[PDB]
Ligand SMILES: O=c1cnn([C@@H]2O[C@H](COP(=O)(O)O)[C@@H](O)[C@H]2O)c(=O)[nH]1
């Protein structure tokens with residue numbers, strides 16, 4: 100995936116008007132938008148097509164897919180039907196649940212992003228201890244896209260080591276959660292940024308500022 | 317605790333509005349509690365919850381297996397309860413803060429959180445099973461009163477019931493299609509969750525009635 104400015108906008112505003120207005124204000128800086136349940140459950144899945152129609156941006160559905168294989172398949176199908184280019188799936192539920200997602204993605208010409216370790220403090224309780232193994236599982240399954248924590252650069256670096264330089268890695272937790280844009284890009288191909296941009300007084304200036312700080316990258 | 321009619325919860329995972337409504341309507345006399353998940357919600361919209369409330373006199377459990385960071389979990393719960401869901405199912409593996417975020421919204425909005433400890437599918441044995449007992453204990457420490465456990469592993473369901481105590485409410489999926497037995501599951505769970513065995517049957521009503529007849533003494 101070729102992400103403009105190595106910056107993915109996490110559009111978690113829950114109002115259609117605000118989401119569209121803010122995204123439009125920073126459109127010149129991005130071409131990849133991560134849409135999650137906050138916006139989808141508030142405005143409906145048709146919002147995905149609206150974004151593609153207005154911005155032509157690629158859409159990553161951050162649905163943290165974490166159900167049994169049968170249900171995961173249905174979730175992916177509904178998501179790709181809505182126009183999502185990729186979907187984020189949890190690895191904690193096991194290999195069969197991830198495979199179900201990979202099957203649908205292959206069938207519809209989309210990509211699966213495997214979330215190995217999360218960025219919040221609670222991730223240390225159960226996810227972190229299984230993260231490396233989840234990453235190895237991704238490798239065994241042929242997964243090429245991963246999600247790792249900006250909040251723990253050493254952990255993000257370990258994830259990169261496991262998956263190799265060829266795999267694609269995106270990373271959330273930048274800004275609001277404490278992650279540094281430049282440091283995160285030492286290991287991730289692209290950073291995910293939400294609040295630092297969409298909650299800023301001037302979203303455009305916020306995005307421009309982040310890009311300025313990583314201009315050499 | 318919620319009074320689930322016939323201790324049977326319908327997992328309505330059909331993705332077509334017309335079919336979902338038809339089938340739910342046909343088993344309406346046997347079930348007053350319906351679990352709606354993403355297969356239907358992502359296909360027909362959150363308003364489907366509103367439509368089910370209007371058409372049937374059923375409680376709604378949103379099986380969204382909430383598994384994000386605290387900030388995002390709060391937003392998901394708010395949107396879900398705003399839509400009319402009585403309760404929401406949340407994953408415990410992402411940690412205490414993520415669960416607490418859901419509990420806080422449920423408390424302020426007057427709704428309930430169901431904590432999913434162990435899952436019923438084969439893959440659950442890779443990472444979830446090993447953390448299940450601790451996730452359950454965490455739920456008890458956090459004040460969680462409603463839980464979800466696997467019918468496919470009676471031994472595990474029994475242990476979960478022990479950890480949460482007799483006062484906690486426990487519902488269990490994996491019955492029918494996945495192999496779980498209704499009666500045996502009800503030895504530990506307050507109610508069983510059944511999807512495909514009912515909604516894919518030539519006669520959903522007869523399928524539901526059959527399951528209920530098999531557990532009549534319970
Ligand atoms: O480990 C993870 C996985 N996903 N996200 C998601 O990435 C975005 C981060 O946004 P923020 O910049 O506003 O913190 C949100 O949509 C959140 O659900 C995380 O923050 N951490």
Ligand SMILES: O=c1cnn([C@@H]2O[C@H](COP(=O)(O)O)[C@@H](O)[C@H]2O)c(=O)[nH]1
Pocket residue numbers: 166167170327329353379432434435436437464465466489490491492493494509510511512513
């Ligand atoms: O551990 C779990 C948690 N949730 N479910 C959900 O419960 C329902 C089971 O339906 P079934 O009777 O068709 O297998 C589906 O909605 C599925 O996502 C499980 O099966 N196992």
